[PDB]
């Protein structure tokens, strides 16, 4: 119900249209090759989503439809944003009605802290909890980048493990940095009062870029 008014007085408002359509228009190949992620791909007509193409976690069981549009301007991405909230509502529904029973943490004391009740009765629980909060679990060497479909876009972390209980280096890949990397073209062909709308649709937040 609360979404409707957000749609009613913005989607139909000709004022919102002329202030959000035909701005920040990004062609498909430029979006893909500028490193853009998430909605810019979805907005510009490109059929791609991490949550569906490589469904992580348990997104397998859930079913829904991502809103790829036609033009890809800031207006089109706005419908993609609004429709994603509607889509997210159903995804909430599907996990809600069939939440499985079971434990909240992996039954691996070497990686998950033992339960408080188990902590004060089991000698192993004390040892495992003790060292887990001093140095933590030792992660075997290797490196991964695995990313998820964050609502900002393709958000991934690239950590390298030294074979100890501490990371060596975790590059903070962020959709916003890729998002903003094409800002030069993005504001091209438009004036200040509407490229600020381009800033809004880009979903830039200065904690993913600047870290």
């Amino acid at each position: 119900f609360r979404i409707d008014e957000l749609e009613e007085m913005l989607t139909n408002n000709r004022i919102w249209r002329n202030r959000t359509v035909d701005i920040g228009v990004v062609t498909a190949e430029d979006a893909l090759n500028y490193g853009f992620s998430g909605v810019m791909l979805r907005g510009s007509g490109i059929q791609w989503d991490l949550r569906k193409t490589q469904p992580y976690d348990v997104y397998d069981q859930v079913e829904f439809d991502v809103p790829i549009g036609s033009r890809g301007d800031c207006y089109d991405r706005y419908l993609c944003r609004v429709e994603e909230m509607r889509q997210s509502l159903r995804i909430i529904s599907q996990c809600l009605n069939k939440m499985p029973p079971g434990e909240i943490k992996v039954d691996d004391a070497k990686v998950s802290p033992p339960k408080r009740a188990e902590m004060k009765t089991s000698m192993e629980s004390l040892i495992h909890h003790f060292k887990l909060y001093t140095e933590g679990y030792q992660v075997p060497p290797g490196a991964t980048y695995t990313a998820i479909e964050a609502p900002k876009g393709e958000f991934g972390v690239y950590l390298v493990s030294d074979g100890s209980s501490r990371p060596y280096r975790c590059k903070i890949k962020a959709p916003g940095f890729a998002h903003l990397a094409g800002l030069d073209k993005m504001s091209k062909g438009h004036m200040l009062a509407d490229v600020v709308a381009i800033i809004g649709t880009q979903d830039i937040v200065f904690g993913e870029v600047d870290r």
């Binding site: 004060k120 089991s122 000698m123 192993e124 629980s125 004390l126 040892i127 495992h128 003790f130 060292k131």
Partner: protein, 263 residues
């Protein structure tokens, strides 16, 4: 020559005969688990944590005192070896008191660290744990003997390195204690090293007790000036001050032990 070759987990080593498995696995760089064995000290073969599996062996063999010869392919990551380590360790851990937050060995405890590399994640224990009284053999050594694992390292250290024959294991069964029976005042000038050989917090330095934890003490390698040997020592530093002194290794100098007033 007499040098005899052994299939150490595959790879072959021409080890010198009479060398035990522990004195062979380190050749390639494999550190066998241990609690009762000490390289600088004698061998007892009691804690049963070095226990490893020999190929085609009916039972896992105590790698602590296994004189090795030709063939005899050892297995590091075998299921039977893991079975032995898993069982034995929770046998140590069975009656061990839940003292890690109050024990100074916390963060520098073998029994703590060995239990996170080759050890279970929970216990099937639902009975009680044996408890033994403390002892008072010095204003430097502090005895929480319920934490003792009866590895007898202190006894062999006392009667072979310090030359004092007063430590021992009184009793039998399971309630026996590694104590001194008659009340005693540990007099040896190498008494401070008794702290650094016990793998648990059963024997601990009284002055340093409840003063610092291992993960915050920056270690600096330095020397001793108390004696004219220049003992290679480790100086623990934290917040512009020193807490406790550890012995380094150089063989000709202090080796692995330091005298008391040095510590």
């Amino acid at each position: 020559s007499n040098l005899i070759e052994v299939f150490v987990d595959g790879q072959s080593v021409m080890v010198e005969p009479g060398t035990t498995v522990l004195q062979a696995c380190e050749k390639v760089g494999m550190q066998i688990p241990r609690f009762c064995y000490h390289e600088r000290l004698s061998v007892a073969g009691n804690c049963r944590m070095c226990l490893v599996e020999i190929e085609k062996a009916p039972k896992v063999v105590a790698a602590c005192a296994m004189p090795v010869m030709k063939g005899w392919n050892i297995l590091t990551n075998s299921e039977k070896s893991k079975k032995a380590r898993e069982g034995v360790m929770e046998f140590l851990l069975a009656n061990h008191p839940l003292d890690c937050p109050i024990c100074d060995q916390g963060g520098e405890c073998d029994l703590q660290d060995q239990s996170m590399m080759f050890g279970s994640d929970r216990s099937r224990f639902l009975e009680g744990k044996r408890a033994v009284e403390d002892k008072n053999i010095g204003p430097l050594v502090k005895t929480i003997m319920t934490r003792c694992i009866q590895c007898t390292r202190c006894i062999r250290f006392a009667s072979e390195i310090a030359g004092v024959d007063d430590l021992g294991t009184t009793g039998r069964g399971n309630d026996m204690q590694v104590g001194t029976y008659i009340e005693k005042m540990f007099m040896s000038e190498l008494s401070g090293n008794i702290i650094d050989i016990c793998p648990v917090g059963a024997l601990t330095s009284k002055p340093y007790a409840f003063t610092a934890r291992p993960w915050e003490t920056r270690k600096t390698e330095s020397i001793d000036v108390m004696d004219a040997v220049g003992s290679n020592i480790v100086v623990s530093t934290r917040t512009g001050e020193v807490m406790r002194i550890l012995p380094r290794m150089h063989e000709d100098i202090n080796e692995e032990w330091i005298s008391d007033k040095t510590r």
